[model samples]
Target: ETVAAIKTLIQQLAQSTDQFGRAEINDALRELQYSLETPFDTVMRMSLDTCQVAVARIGSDLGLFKHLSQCASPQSAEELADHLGCGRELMSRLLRYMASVRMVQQTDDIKYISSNITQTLAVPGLEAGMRHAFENLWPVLMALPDFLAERKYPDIVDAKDTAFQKAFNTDQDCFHWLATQPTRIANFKVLLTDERTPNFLSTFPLEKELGSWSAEPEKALFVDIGGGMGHACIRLREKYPNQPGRVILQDLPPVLQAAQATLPLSGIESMPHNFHTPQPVQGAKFYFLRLILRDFPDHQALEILQNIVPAMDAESRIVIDDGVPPEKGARWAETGTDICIMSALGSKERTQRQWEELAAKAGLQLQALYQYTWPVVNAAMVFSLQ
Candidate 1:
């Protein structure tokens, strides 16, 4: 029966054309294959994958891609080693190993060159994400299984019981820990604000919707809940300079202080408010949250939503800037992110059905879900009072 299941997944892989379907097929294969592994060799291979990831992270941090730039032809391993002031033998081994994963290209001439993937790893946003993964997330994830098993913790439902806590032996949750690390926080913020980072600014009907809002001129038009550095608010003001009403950025006190420098919109107000508590500002035309909900478990996610409900008028809109997980197939990136949330914060990504369940539980109804026919995950959903 197990052999038949493995064969079925392999057939799924053979038949799949799309990236997402292929990935989902592989996920099934891996899970079922692990069950048959008799486990000893499987555990060894898992550790090897971790080591492989570490080596990739090492290459990204050390500017390996940059060293190979301007190569008309693959450079000899010795030449690359000399440029980096590393032992030739060691550099050659690392480069050859990197090439095995398509991170670098190798020639029969025993030379090496950067691949497209190698160059991408060297970019600031991606490099930061990788660095954060290794430095912050890996430790937590590595310890997660034993931590849960030892405590007999059936489900990781509370923010109080975070994997980050078990890794660092600290009571502070991830956001509080992040607040102290300026360098890592700066890098992570880059990951969020990078032009390619999925955000709702372009897709949403902001300017057109703002035009119809009959709110008083002094009333807040948009409230950016948990907004960091006020980037979205700054972009909104830049896009809709003539639009009436105030644009407010709500975050922790320190985040608001930083936003004063990063968010240059003159009339924009920076408000210190936590979304977990009750919403102090009432009846804004829209409450916007980008890359926020996926960080919390369902209960906490509901807390954030319930907090917003009392603040909303019948007309007020709650705009969610996140993805609905694939109902059928899985994307590699989305699945990776889902695990990261679970590992770091004891949270999980929500599927469309899960999203619907959460929204109804929070006493809000989904007004519209704006997404394309293609398998893109980042869809902006608009919600209003039920």
Candidate 2:
């Protein structure tokens, strides 16, 4: 019966091509693996999985993935080491380990070839993501056990007092500390350019939702709070070329200055405004926040919403683009992101109930939820005055 069930899952997995379909099948496979694993197997799997990331990072730093990915044919461990100027013996062992994890393909006794994973690691944004994960997030995650134990496993609520501060030995929050490190911050920003989800605009019914609003040029149509580099603003203008009313992009002064210098935001205005304070732009048709609240815990997130609440009119709506994972059985990406933000920023990805609760607390009602991704649930939630 177990063998038959395994075969059934494999067939379903083979048939699925889209991400959501594959993700559901993958979850079933993981559940099967969990059921079959002994305690010893579980421990060994956990330890070895952690080691794989470290090994991948080492390979990344050495430019092994880039070199291997560009090669026309399979290369020997000795050849790879010679080209990259590393020790042949060390390269051989690394290659063996990478092959075992399927980061690279081993063809013979010593020869290796690049796999899809190798090519992906060679991409600059993805490379930066790996580096950021190892160099920044790993230390914070390592500190979590002790940090939690010392606090008697209390809920982490303060951004300034999390495992991040403990790991980095700083009083400043993660964002403030990251601001001081030029290279690290640049790498971190590079990772932001790698969003793979379907654009919220494409998924959400923008025309139908906001079509009735007046097309007055001076009116505020969309205010992107803490929008980095104004990518969403640019996309919005492109989608609605004749979209009336002003589209404003707001962020920190330094971030706004950098964005204004680099981007040719023809139809958008940039404003330097921290969201922790009262919102200055009043009666905007829609106040959009993309991936901002996940960096804040409930108290801070509620504060952000409350700040905007005073600025909102009866007609105004707040559109939030963030993850809204299901109450249970969240995929690895969703759960991993939840833990990462918790460790680094003392925040979390909220469920539907959590989002609704935050909305209610801020004197708003959830009007609609447009989920674009499945199993992971990246969504655009629209809220209006209660």
Candidate 3:
């Protein structure tokens, strides 16, 4: 019955000879083929593919993409090796595999140039993020089930008892563990600062909702709670020069210190404030939780929200900038990040209903939701105290 349904879809798709139809119809067949494959066949591909990602990481880490970007035209593997001072034979093998996947575009003569993927890899933050994924996250994820089994834990629910702690055999939570690693810290910020992922303050028309800076001089316009390095606030300051009110960036002490140093000229006030404790800033026009709530389960998420209850006035907006999985064509990046958050911190990507329910539980009401119509496909929910 499954096979019959699959063929029916394939046959219907095959009727269209247009380029995009031709492109996707091939993948539809490939997926159907995988569904019919023996378990071990799929398993073997999954096991071997990690090594391919490692090779891409090598190219990114070694500045191969950046070196190729400098070239006016495609270059031979030998030329690439000499330019980067890498072993000629090794570069030949690496470039050959990369070209096969079209990660690096190759000419008829077998010389290579930067493909779109290669160009993106040349971004330092992106390359570091890839390294952190394979080097740090993959191992922890692989060990999660075994770790839970050994402890006889019924489920992964506690942030303290996370896959990260279990795999590394450390008592500290993921945040503290990442504190010692500068590369991981920067890479994490990259995930938040993705131009593709919609920025809440800029994306939403705030002036229409909250009065202009000229009208509201005393109202604190924005408070970025748990805002690591104040990226959102920095973006908002440039976006709205005549801001509604003062823009404050709050986080743990160590994070605030780093934010101060890196964003000295940003003009966004940095505060050493923990969101777990009560929110000290009162009645801010907009409070942002960018890349914050998804780091913990319901109980922890509630605690973070509950802390802000005392500070929120009826007019204040608690804007949550986070992912809500798509009803259709969900991005793989969103799916993977959800699982990684689940494994590493016992957190999750919430659905719209879940967010509504969560807000009620935390003594807040879901006032409005802005679903971004951009390529990134992320959502922001505005909450107010009930």
Candidate 4:
């Protein structure tokens, strides 16, 4: 009866477009695997997990995934080896391992083709994401144990002295350190703009939310704090092309320079400003913070909100685009992100209650929460002055 119920649930989830249900089913399936696994099975699975990501990174660096993605048909290991200038035997063994892990497809004994995973990893932004994960995040995660042990297992709250700082041996925070590296910073920027989560604009009622706002040319309609590459501002302009008022993108000076070079900011203005300090664009109808606050702990996050609080009029609204994980039964992605943020930035993916409390500290109230994604709960937390 239990098995039948589980099978029925899986079938329903598979058929439906309910993303949250689908994610839950995936988690349940994974849990089922764990529940059924023997002692050796668990050992092998745990031991090999790290190698899987490392192998993918290696494949990415070798251009194997990209080459296979671009291929018209399955290519032999020898051909792949020749194309990528690696040894035939090594390439054959690597391809076999990758196929076993479902990163690529083994059509024949020696021939291989790109899988969906291969194609996705071939994408420039995702490729950069893999690199960033392997090079940057992996080291911090690896060092987390020693870092905790060294610090007597205290809760990591300071961004300056977390596992990231320990791994990289730098006093500067993760973002500042990334800024110093040209290629890494560029990849980081690409990762930032890559929209894996549901966008706030899709969930939040933009037209209705800003309905009462004036259309004065000088008045700011939207100010995207710490907005990278002006992607959000560009999307706003595209969404409401006829809407009057300035849409501004604020970031560090170098980021703004890159945004100016890459993005067509014809209508949107690019401004260099730090969020830790006071907000310069006063009385904007909306101050959008997409995936910004999760990078800081309560104190810093409070400061960020407080900085903007003084600049807001009664009409101004702060729209925070981030994850608000549930108190219980949070999805794997959300938990993984929370841990990653904790390790790298000494921050966390906040809960809705936590968000409300933080906003309250800054003398603001949570007007509404528009959750777009399911199971993981990536949402827009709109705040206004109390």
Provide TM-scores for the models.
Answer: 0.77, 0.89, 0.82, 0.92
Task: Give a tens-digit lDDT track for model 2, residues 1-386.
Answer: 99899788777766867877777777877888889999999999988888877998899889999999999999999999999988989989999999998899999666899999999999987998889888999999999999999989988888998999999999999878988898897786677556554678877888778855664646788999998878788788878888688899999887787677655637789998999999999888889999999999899899999999999878889998999988877778889998899989989989989999988999999999998877778898999999
Q: Which residue pairs overlap in candidate 2's backbone?
A: none
**Ranking of predictions according to TM-score:** 4, 2, 3, 1
What is candidate 3's CA lDDT for residue 168? Answer: 75
Better of 1 and 2 by lDDT: 2
Runs with alpha carbons beyond 4 Å of true place in candidate 4: 1-21
Per-residue accuracy of model 1 over 99-146 as CA lDDT, tens digit each: 887888888887887788778776776777777778898898888888
Higher-scoring candidate on TM-score, 2 or 4: 4
Error of 4 at 35 (Å): 2.1
1-386: candidate 3 lDDT, tens digit per residue? 99799778777777756544654667566667689879998998777667767887888767898888777987999988997888999999999888877678999998999898888777766666677778788878888788878878666788888788877778888878888877777677655444433466545877776842232546678899988877788778878887557789998775677566667575688888888899998778888997688888999899999998888777888998888776566555577788798888889887778888888998888877776534334667889878
What is the per-residue lDDT of model 4 for residues 177-237, given as tens digits with 9 covering 90 to 100? 9868777876787776565644667777887788667857589999999998877888788
- Quantify all predictions' global Cα lDDT against the true fold: 0.78, 0.87, 0.78, 0.87
RMSD to the native, candidate 2?
3.1
Report the Cα lDDT for candidate 1.
Answer: 0.78
Per-residue error for 2 in candidate 1, Å, reads 32
In TM-score terms, candidate 3 sits at 0.82
Clashes of each: 0, 0, 0, 0
The predicted structure with the larger TM-score, 1 or 3, is 3
